[PDB]
Structure formats: C-alpha cells, structure tokens
Amino acid sequence: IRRAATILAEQLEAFVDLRDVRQPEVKEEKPEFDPILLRPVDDLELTVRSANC
C-alpha cells in the first residue's frame, strides 16, 4: 500500500520543516564586437565527433 497512500501521508512535511525548491534564468541577449566571440567552432582546431555533437 504505501505509494498508494503517499499523496496523503507525504502531504505532512508540507506544513513544517519549512525549506523549499526553485530554478533560475541565466543568459544574455547577444551580440557585438570585438569578433573574439563572433566565431563558430571552425576556429578551434578540434576533432569530428566533437564537431557533430
């Protein structure tokens, strides 16, 4: 039975021990000079399976 009653048993920690959970936003909107960043992987001199994935 326990998993079949868990959305009623594990609904109790819900009211105490009161630390919680969440995710962010992290990027910027792109792009300008100097062209040190304005380059594809072509500029790196690296292998082919890397260049596929």
Next chain:
DNA sequence: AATCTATCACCGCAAGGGATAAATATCTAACACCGTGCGTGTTGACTATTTTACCTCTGGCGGTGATAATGGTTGCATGTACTAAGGAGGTTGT
C-alpha cells in the same frame, strides 16, 4: 517603539536514507574503406521539339423548314383581427 514570558512548537543536533559519480563494461555509431551502378561526358543517329508550309479536321454560327396543323390556359393570394381610408348615392338637411 521598546520590553519579555510563556506559548505552540522549530530547532537542537542524533540518526539514516537516496543519491550520484566513480569505475568498469557494455553498447552503438561514425567513419574509412571498398564496390557498385548510375546519371559523369561527348558523340552520333535517331525521330518526331518546334517552326512553316501545305492539304484539307473541327467547330464557328448563320440560316430558317410547308399535305396540314388558326377560342387559350391557369389554379389556389385568402378565409383571421384589427380598423383607417376611399368609395358609393339617396336624402334630409347645411
């Protein structure tokens, strides 16, 4: 807006669960080779791409028939409830 005692309880702080990431081992996939066969190339003969010419399709549309035929079709607007208007004409009045 500071103070705290005295709530109902979170912290006070022991235990232990899952997790994930390391190492291993398996999987697959990316590739480089090879071989196939197709769409790599010019040339050449074919036959029917197009044009024009000719001989002779399809379909443009104009034209109108005569033994005689010589009183026709057409069905349901609507049945109710109102009442405002015009139409009638005789006459007893203006």
